[PDB]
Amino acid sequence: GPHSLRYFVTAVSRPGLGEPRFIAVGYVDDTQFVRFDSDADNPRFEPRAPWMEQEGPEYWEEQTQRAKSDEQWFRVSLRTAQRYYNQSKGGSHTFQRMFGCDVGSDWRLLRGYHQFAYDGRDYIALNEDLKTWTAADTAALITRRKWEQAGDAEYYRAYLEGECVEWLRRYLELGNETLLRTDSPKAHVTYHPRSQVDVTLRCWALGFYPADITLTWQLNGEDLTQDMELVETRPAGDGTFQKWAAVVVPLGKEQNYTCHVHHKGLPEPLTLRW
């Protein structure tokens, strides 16, 4: 089956307060498994999932040292970034990196990532061919130019196709009990009085993993014309996720509405009437 290994890295400069905030989190699919927090009393990569606690000190020391090295790079990059743009000194700014690998069911690199954002906007990204770069603007062009000449594409392709995919395999083994599961959603509709003519119908999907889900309403079978509310999928706190979708329907007309739920853990899609 399809799986992914992702790191989400964040650095925030804080002038007058000390060195920048630096945090990296690691995910396999929708399950977090490692972290680095520069404000922690002792800065080190540490496990954030039960199945990672068995790893040897060599694992943790190499992870910690690769992160501390990345942190340093971010300090320079924040400074370099502020100069490239000609921004005012003294302000707080953000740098983000996302990298990792998606593999398909034939254990094959569907997509490798090495991309950056400055102040919440795209900066530079390694294209899908793992050979070329996309610069978001004339500042990033300077960086693209340097990374082209230095051969950074090949350096990270080697990582993306090797270490990344090789250790994704290992993580899936370590946590097979939890990672390879499909918790189906428990679904139900709730009824909430609004006005003297309308009423709210809310369709709930709870307790499911992975986080991808499809939740909608339809009237008699065709798509909606009204204005459905569909909230962001959200973590329950225990490794499962929640979502709901709501519609405002005419009193007396509630039976023409159905809620549909599609999920990887549902051998049949759900159809709920109130």
């Binding site: 992870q63 992160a67 990345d70 370099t80 340097k146 950074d152 270490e163």
Partner: peptide, 10 residues
């Protein structure tokens, strides 16, 4: 497994 140490600068 974290990415290997950066080689080029921004």
């Amino acid at each position: 497994f974290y990415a290997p140490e950066p080689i080029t600068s921004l």
